[PDB]
Design a protein around this ligand. Structure first.
Ligand SMILES: [Mn+2]
Ligand SMILES: [Mn+2]
Ligand SMILES: [Mn+2]
Ligand SMILES: [Mn+2]
Lengths: 328, 328
């Protein structure tokens, strides 16, 4: 099994005004997107050390009582209004992974979207401050930190696709973005529940089977442990770990938009019995956001695909996946 | 490379009233769907011979101007109303396969679904009668012929999953079915456009890369060719040909419904440089059809997955695929 070619692109230029430097990064992004579809963003300026620290603390200290009080509808029938945001418990013998998902901090009861009960929009649930002081404040600030980085990455993607710099970004707004953060925890267990290990056809033990992300792009931070594999033309290939950078990849919405010029990499998660964490930020646009499809391989640049609002795309994509497991 | 275990099930009982024999067939269908996911429905009562003949006649006699005049919007920019129904042209150097797709014969301009301009509903386009005498009449009857077979196989699928006999079939109706028949043509070319030959990670030359079907179930007739391969726990295995039976497999909708108890088989198509044809019938329900997901593995049989109306399933499933190539 070989290592997938996953370059480390210095993303910092995207935060600056040097059009020349930006274009160079856009060139490197474009090339990764058309190869493995995965690339590391290095020099992103995010205190990734505190992030892992505060997340391990949260997962290790949260009590069973709280997990249950924050559990989404799939776990706790009581919470009918919690579909995405909340705690995803582990099911003894059946599920070993746990995770905590939260949405846009601006989604308060005063928010029009929440008031109008528009699908996919929810209000975040948080643990008690006495048992987890400052957690919320840390978690909400981080949201805006990745929002910042992702916003910089989307300008890179627009340039790479030869579109105007704010082609994508213009739809990534703080007051309505549907992006979500998921704090995943992969436990260490002995014996490790057999039912929680799926075996790929080539035999590989996996925590999660193949799939394409349901997002525009996915910004992930993950502790130094190897588990990801991308399906390339040479079959599956391991992706090297790197606790300093963010692993970036396109979701099916980018594939839709670019008429597959930038495909959504199909990937899977190997099973490793080791306490580690995975923290993806799924970059989603506004509910009413619509971008007309295009094919960069065509002279006109025109595509036959018809525009699909982000709300419809998101709704469908989520309903297709296992509510109990999630990821988005 | 080995042969996949594809049982030849006698489907005749499904057309009768003998509940006993019906349950017997059901058990067999259940076993197949849980193994390779493929099975040959033999004794279906359809004149498969006349079918290959008329079809062969069609593909060899239709002229390029006729193809252009029937081409869908993705090829002929003029026919804005043709998205699914019509001809799919080959692209010299890039695409060798060609196909003609038609829908429910009852969809006419008076049909409420067509007047309402609901997605996925179209009115068939057909070749000129003077030039292709009796083709339209043959094709329409055939639609109803396989419809009858599918209607009965759906009763078999219901019994296999412990549901009432009409659990699926009550949604499979002549007035609104979205099922489609695609007459695929595999040409003989020398030289063959290298571009039209995809090479799998394991080296096999392919016409079509791995996938799962966008359908409730797929009912395929293919004669004098061996081009299918199923990915099993032992890797890809060849499916034996059988010019007397219909190869049956599940689409992703069945998987979503049964919470994956009946997985949609991952299959690919081997490159065969010879004039052959394939005729898949995609069993799709009505636009408004909603079936409640269940898990035959749970006592309550409750699922996490949410109900998905077929129209939403199909609209989204179709847009994910390349319009120029199709299949559904
Ligand atoms: Mn409560
Ligand atoms: Mn993923
Ligand atoms: Mn015309
Ligand atoms: Mn297929």
């Amino acid at each position: 099994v070989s290592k997938a070619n996953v370059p480390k692109i210095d993303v910092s230029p995207l935060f600056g005004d040097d059009q020349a430097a930006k274009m160079r990064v856009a060139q490197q992004i474009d090339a990764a997107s058309r190869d493995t579809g995965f690339f590391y963003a290095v020099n992103h300026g995010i205190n990734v050390q505190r992030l892992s620290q505060k997340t391990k603390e949260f997962h290790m200290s949260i009590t069973p009582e709280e997990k249950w009080d924050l559990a989404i509808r799939a776990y706790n029938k009581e919470h009918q209004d919690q579909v995405r945001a909340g705690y995803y418990l582990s099911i003894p013998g059946k599920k070993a992974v746990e995770s905590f998902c939260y949405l846009n901090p601006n989604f308060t009861p005063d928010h029009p979207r929440i008031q109008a009960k528009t699908p996919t929009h929810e209000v975040n649930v948080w643990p008690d401050e006495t048992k987890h002081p400052g957690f919320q404040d840390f978690a909400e600030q981080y949201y805006w930190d990745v929002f910042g980085l992702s916003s910089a990455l989307l300008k890179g993607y627009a340039l790479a696709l030869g579109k105007e710099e704010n082609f994508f970004a213009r739809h990534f707004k703080p007051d309505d973005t549907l992006a979500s953060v998921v704090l995943i925890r992969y436990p260490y267990l002995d014996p490790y529940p057999e039912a929680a290990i799926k075996t790929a056809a080539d035999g590989t033990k996996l925590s999660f089977e193949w799939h394409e992300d349901v997002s525009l792009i996915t910004v992930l931070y993950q502790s130094n442990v190897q588990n990801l594999q991308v399906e390339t033309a040479a079959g599956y290939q391991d992706i090297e770990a790197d606790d300093t950078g963010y692993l970036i990849n396109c979701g099916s919405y980018m594939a839709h938009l670019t008429n597959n010029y930038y495909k959504a990499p199909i990937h899977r998660v190997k099973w490793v019995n080791a306490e580690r964490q995975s923290l993806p930020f799924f970059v989603n646009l506004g509910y009413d956001s619509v971008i007309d499809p295009f094919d960069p391989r065509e002279p006109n640049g025109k595509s036959d695909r018809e525009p699909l609002s982000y709300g419809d795309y998101l709704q469908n994509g989520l309903v297709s996946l296992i509510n109990k497991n999630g990821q988005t």
